User: What shape does this take?
Amino acid sequence: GGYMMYHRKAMGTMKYSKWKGAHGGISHFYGRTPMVEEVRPNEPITLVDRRIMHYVHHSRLRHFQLFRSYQEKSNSTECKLREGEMLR
Amino acid sequence: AKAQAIRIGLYPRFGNPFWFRSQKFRPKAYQENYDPTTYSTKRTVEHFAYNWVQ
Amino acid sequence: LKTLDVREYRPLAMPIEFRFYQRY
Amino acid sequence: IAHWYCGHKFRHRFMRDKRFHPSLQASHDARNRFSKRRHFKTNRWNYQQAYRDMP
Amino acid sequence: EHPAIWLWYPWRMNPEPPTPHMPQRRALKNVHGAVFNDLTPVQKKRQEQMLYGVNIPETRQMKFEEQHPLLAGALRKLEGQPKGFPFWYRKYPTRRHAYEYRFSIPVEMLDGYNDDVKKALSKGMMSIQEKQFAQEAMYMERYAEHDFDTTSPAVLAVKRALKCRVLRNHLLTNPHNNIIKTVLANTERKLNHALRRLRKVDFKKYWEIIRDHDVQDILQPPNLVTYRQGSYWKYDWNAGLAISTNLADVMDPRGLNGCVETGRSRSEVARDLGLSYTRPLHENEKKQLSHQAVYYERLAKFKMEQPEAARAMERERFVRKFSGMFVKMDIRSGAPDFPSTYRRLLGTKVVRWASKRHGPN
Amino acid sequence: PHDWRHFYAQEKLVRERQQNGHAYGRRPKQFSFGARYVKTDGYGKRPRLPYNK
Amino acid sequence: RWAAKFYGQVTFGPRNYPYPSSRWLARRFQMKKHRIIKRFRFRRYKLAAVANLPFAKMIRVGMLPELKSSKTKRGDVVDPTLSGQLVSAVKNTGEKRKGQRTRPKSKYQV
Amino acid sequence: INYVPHAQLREHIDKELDKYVAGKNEPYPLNFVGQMPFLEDGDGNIVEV
Amino acid sequence: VFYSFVLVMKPRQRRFTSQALREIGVAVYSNGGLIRSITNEGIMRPYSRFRDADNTPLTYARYIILQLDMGEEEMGKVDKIIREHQDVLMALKLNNLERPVGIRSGNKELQAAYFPLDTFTRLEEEINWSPQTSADIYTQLEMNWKEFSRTRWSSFLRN
Amino acid sequence: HRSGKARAFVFRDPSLRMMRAGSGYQQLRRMGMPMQVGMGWR
RNA sequence: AUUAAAAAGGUAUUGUUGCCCACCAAUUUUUAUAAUAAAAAUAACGUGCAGUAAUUAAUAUAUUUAUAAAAAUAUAUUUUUUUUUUUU
RNA sequence: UAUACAAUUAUCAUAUUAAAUUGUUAAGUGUUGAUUUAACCAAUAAAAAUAUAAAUAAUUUUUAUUUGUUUUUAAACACCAUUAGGUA
Ligand SMILES: [Mg+2]
Ligand SMILES: [Mg+2]
Ligand SMILES: [Mg+2]
Ligand SMILES: [Mg+2]
Ligand SMILES: [Mg+2]
Ligand SMILES: [Mg+2]
Ligand SMILES: [Mg+2]
Ligand SMILES: [Mg+2]
Ligand SMILES: [Mg+2]
Ligand SMILES: [Mg+2]
Ligand SMILES: [Mg+2]
Ligand SMILES: [Mg+2]
Ligand SMILES: [Mg+2]
Ligand SMILES: [Mg+2]
Ligand SMILES: [Mg+2]
Ligand SMILES: [Mg+2]
Assistant: This one.
């Protein structure tokens, strides 16, 4: 069945399954791209990445994304969590 | 703003296209200067260290 | 219900709001 | 409180007294004190065109 | 199919939806439980007459000319030429008074400008909310006793009447916002107050408000119980206008009062001053009365022309007096209410009456 | 968060008085992912205030 | 709502107890409510209120001679026309007709 | 304010569609979004980027 | 302004763009309203590809700004006219232009209480600033204020 | 005790309790308010 | 040359070998008799192991499910134990 | 058997001066395939973002109105059953 992109089963690989959207160049992700890093000449992409990832992690975005994109939680438990977080 | 801008196609549904340009306007606070008001506990202890070692 | 205490449980704490509810 | 009036508990007595309390009496605003609920939602489905002899 | 059957499975919180179904869209009640499917032709006409536009009555141009003839003389010189001094200000005492163009712009201030501007501030360009405020200001002006008057019963009544109509048609379109159901009902209650105060202030404006906006439905006493206790009339006692009438212009006061030393009623002193205060009669009363007046002509003619039938009936009455329950007229026999004063007879001894009370007391 | 319950209550109170002093702790019913665009005319396409059910 | 939220007094703690109900007590009464509701479910209870009848007096429909669960107890006396109609209502409630609003179904409803 | 009347419509529309005509002697005006958009010639083909 | 629009349109051959804008203009004039400005902009590259009537996604589109004076009743008609036209990809509507966000909050307006005629007289451009605006207009503005304020009465009291 | 009688925080001023009693039944009988409609004490 | 000190709950009450939960027999007693009436006393037998943050945290409403405690889902919630970016 | 609640703050069911209601957007095809799960089984997978001002306070709405149950799957996720479907 139709899944969202952050869904578990989203991009499937099976005999039936096929990926949705124009997948290269100007793509399905066209204006949906959260970050863009032009790689400076003679710069390993491992620094690029670890900077991106540190960024998301310290601002608790990767937190949020991981959280909401795995399982469902009712608006009450979600409130309880965000407010508990904020109060701590 | 972001809502309108998006539905007119003048802003992306994700991401910040001005992220770098916008860095001027943000108070980037150098680890070398000290602002007495921070919730940064690292910077404080850093300058403590610096002066003690001095 | 069961009309009697199955558990003999005596908590000894006397929180002031439980007692004087006129003032708190 | 004599124990034989109204129910076998005490609070039943004071609950009947509330039908005699002065500031609680029935009027044009507070009505149907004793059965409110038998009359509730009684005319919801009763459609009555209001009365106009004047244009 | 026959009557609504609710069906409730007791483990479930609430019953199943009943029977051949209640009408799919819930009825819209007024404050008293009466139902309106839609606005009346008259109200409808009021909304159509608000929608397409409104106008200041030249009533105001007139009184502006007769009150301040100098200013109207100046404007009379200056027509079409652009003005830098607003001579017309007396004509519009209040911000609210100028409704013909948006943002309270008096007409003659528009003289020397572009006609695009003239079309930009015109009625057609108003929002709906603005247009309501237009209808409201014009009416408030018609019934106001001075310019800055709001609080007065007449003005209040009209503004509330309008607001009520608006909310009504609103609910006609988009069915469930119960916020506005409630606001409508509250407005209606406050309208009820304003009107019932009006008819004791002056009743003709009261009348023609009811005839203009067609609210007679919220003046209808809600239910028989509270009406019978005289708490519908009790209202204007509370509002304090209960004695306000100032008789002498209407209803000459001489025959309204009883005699204190004589003890004769007002019907009496009226009789003696040779006056008749008698409310207009419907058909019932005229007919009963006219049938009563003539008992003696009928009787006279009867006993003259036909002594036999008469004499038979008389035999009946006469012998009857000697038969029957009581012959004697004492405190017992002469109890005006027999079942009431002896209730203690009613089950066992006396079988005539099933109940101890047939009247107020 | 429950230690701050009084605070939260203050806001529930507010959302109730906006509703004519009625529905306490009530919230708008969640709808559907496609709520607006799958529903025909005459049916509510967006979640209402709870008193406005 | 018609039915009762609770059975017995579920908020009984000392004054100023800063909750409607303690865990213990609410658990007891959840037991009570549980037993009652289970009794209603297994005995296949049915009630009705009819238009133009005293409402607070509810005909026991689960006790009618047709719909009765027991093969022994004498059920109840309800007028032949009204009984036929009640039977037709209970019967036509069961299944989902397309276009009607979906309403929750159970074994015990039938 | 210059209001477009009904008589002046297409004249104005066309004066506007020719704002960026892909050649001129003078500096070009920007957007409301503050961009220099594609210069199209007569008939709206995408000539200068 | 009373109303505004941003109209994202498919970049067609000019006769078609002229036709379409004439359709919309005639759809405004019919309904008894005015046009303050119909502003043209170029063919831009948006952040979102748009699909037109053919469901063929579009990388480029022409932007066109509308500023109108209507009633709010039959702008409903104008609106469902506009959104239903095949060559209008998107339309965003601004109804807030008479009372924008920045005014009438806790006596923020000096010498008056919400004078409405300020933001009506105005066009959209000066209510909502475009990115390129810099400190330079701070000069231009006043050379256009002082100047205006000098000649207004003289010019108005002529006729 | 949610289910049970309200208790005063402190006592009631007895003096004040006697001051509120002026119009009570006994003082009324002594004023002669109620009508004597029956034989009464012998 | 790799690590370790500091924050925590109990329906029990010398305390988890602690206590409790429902069905499943007899009986006792009141009644407003719904598969097999309801409710209250109760000390057998047999099934489990529901609860005490308690072996998928609990509590309330809602709907469903059922040898028996109860279990699944939808909401609210802590009488459950906390983990904490003032533009990076 | 009779013999003196509270009235300054008390959590389960008798509400009441309130500004809402209405918005048509998004997403979809290249190719030969072990995705999700602690673990099973059916089997295209992508997606649905915009509104403030304003509505005057109280006095007869309590048979009136009102407190998360909702047409359309030929649209999915999700949930329930297990390859047949239900529901959404
Ligand atoms: Mg399917
Ligand atoms: Mg104990
Ligand atoms: Mg303890
Ligand atoms: Mg008598
Ligand atoms: Mg008798
Ligand atoms: Mg017995
Ligand atoms: Mg029993
Ligand atoms: Mg459990
Ligand atoms: Mg256990
Ligand atoms: Mg557990
Ligand atoms: Mg539970
Ligand atoms: Mg339950
Ligand atoms: Mg079980
Ligand atoms: Mg349960
Ligand atoms: Mg109560
Ligand atoms: Mg459906």
Q: What stands out?
A: Residues 14 and 66 of chain A are 25 Å apart (CA to CA). The longest helix of chain A spans residues 45-58.
